[PDB]
């Protein structure tokens, strides 16, 4: 029993953007107050906890085009 | 018993955008107050917890076109 | 018993957008107050919890076109 | 017993939009107050809980065209 | 039983962006206050905890185009 | 014409209060938002204006007994 | 014409208070946002204006007994 | 015409307070945001203006008994 | 015409307070943000302006008893 | 015309306070941000301006009893 597998995907996609002028952005967060209480904490795996945070993020990219592509081939016998 | 598999998808997609002028954005969060109470915490897996947060995000991309593409081929015997 | 499988999908889709001028956006959240109480917490899987949050998000992309495409081929014997 | 399978879908769809001018958007949330009480919490699966939140989202994309396409081929013997 | 596997995906994708002028960005976070209490902490895995943080991030890239591509081939006998 | 005026009021009043125990008071205002617009403003007298305010007052006195007493004698000829 | 005026008011008032125990007071204002617009402002007298304020006052006196007493005698000829 | 004026008010008032124990007071203001706009400002008198303020006052006196007493005698001819 | 004026007020008032124990006071202001705009400012009198302030005051006196007393005698001819 | 004026007020007032123990005071201001804009400023009188300030005051006196007393006698002819 012969098994033949051909895996030749083709991609020619394009992801572009144009923006003539970009600016004049104001970000003025007005403070705040946060309080958290805990006693026991157990993390044993791929964990990404985030406890008691006060964050401000100003994200202004001229591009920001995102492309994700995943290929997977599994063979079992 | 011979098995033949051909896997040749073709992609020529395009994802574009045009924006002549972009700006004059005002973000003024007015504070706040948050309180959380816990005692026991057990995370053992692919967890993404987020406890007691006060966040402000200003996200202004000139592009921001997103493309996700996944291929998968599983063979069992 | 010979088995022949041909998998050649074709895609030429396009997802575009045009916007001559974009701006003059005001975001003024007026604070707030949130309180949460818990004692026992067990997360063991692909969990995405989010407890006790006060968030403001200003999302202004000039593009923002999203395309998701998934292919899957499973063979069993 | 020979089995022949041909899988060649064709797509040439387009999803576009035009907007000459876009702006002058005001978002003024007037605060609030939320309180939640719990003691036992067990999440063991693909869960997406969200407990005790006060959120404001201002989403203004110049594009925002969304396209989702999924292909699946299952073979059993 | 001979097994032949051909794995020749082709990629010619492009991810570009143009932005004529970009600037005039103001980020003025107004302080804050955060307090966290815990006693026991056990992390034994790929953990990425983050406890009690007050962060401000100003992220302004002229490019910022992101591309992620993963290939995987598993053979079992 | 002789005029005789005798002005001898007598006061022995008492204003007391007793409170054995006083406490456990919670004041949690949930933010808000107020906007006022004006152009011309003229105040020329004993004025006590108050324009565009967002106030929270927590007033807990153990005493708080108030006594006001005014005497006035006017003579004309 | 002889005029005789006697002005001998008597006061023996008392204003007291007792409070055995006083405490456990929580004041947690949740932020806010206020905006005022004006162009012309003229104050020429005993004025006590207050424009565009965001105030929190926690007033806890153990006493706080207030007494106001005014005497006035006017003679004209 | 002889004029005789006798002005002998008597005061023996007392203003006291007792408080056995006083404490455990929490004041946690959660930020905020205030904006004021003006162009012309003229104050020529006993004025007490206060423009664009964000204040927090924690006033805890063990006493705090206030007494105001004013005497006035005006003679005209 | 002889004029006789006798001005002998008597005061024996007392203003006291007792507080056995006083403490455990927490003051935690959570920041904020204030902005004021003006161009013309004219103050020519007993003025007490206060423009664009962010203040926190923690006032804890063990005493704090206040007494104000004013006498005035005006004679005209 | 002889004029006789006798001005002999008597004061024996007392203003006291007792506080057995006083302490354990925490003052933790969480920053902030204030901005003021002006161009013309004219002060010609008894003025007490205060522009663009960020102040924290911790005032803890063991005494703090205040007494104000003013006498005035005006004679005209």
From Swiss-Prot, chains A, B, C, D, E, F, G, H, I, J:
Highest taxon of the lineage: Eukaryota
Positions bearing N6-acetyllysine: 8, 14, 18, 28, 40, 44, 66
Compartment list: Cytoplasm, Cytosol; Cell membrane; Cytoplasm, Cytoskeleton; Cell projection, Axon
Cross-link Glycyl lysine isopeptide (Lys-Gly) (interchain with G-Cter in ubiquitin), sequence positions: 8, 14, 18, 28, 40, 44, 50, 66, 72
Positions of post-translational Phosphoserine modification: 2, 21, 49, 53
Illness: In Alzheimer disease, the neuronal cytoskeleton in the brain is progressively disrupted and replaced by tangles of paired helical filaments (PHF) and straight filaments, mainly composed of hyperphosphorylated forms of TAU (PHF-TAU or AD P-TAU). O-GlcNAcylation is greatly reduced in Alzheimer disease brain cerebral cortex leading to an increase in TAU/MAPT phosphorylations.
Biological role: Promotes microtubule assembly and stability, and might be involved in the establishment and maintenance of neuronal polarity. The C-terminus binds axonal microtubules while the N-terminus binds neural plasma membrane components, suggesting that tau functions as a linker protein between both. Axonal polarity is predetermined by TAU/MAPT localization (in the neuronal cell) in the domain of the cell body defined by the centrosome. The short isoforms allow plasticity of the cytoskeleton whereas the longer isoforms may preferentially play a role in its stabilization.
Complex and partners: Interacts with MARK1, MARK2, MARK3 and MARK4. Interacts with PSMC2 through SQSTM1. Interacts with SQSTM1 when polyubiquitinated. Interacts with FKBP4. Binds to CSNK1D. Interacts with SGK1. Interacts with PIN1. Interacts with LRRK2. Interacts with LRP1, leading to endocytosis; this interaction is reduced in the presence of LRPAP1/RAP.
Protein name: Microtubule-associated protein tau
Provenance organism: Homo sapiens
Source taxonomy: Eukaryota, Metazoa, Chordata, Craniata, Vertebrata
Gene: MAPT
Full-length numbering of the shown residues: 621 to 697 of 758
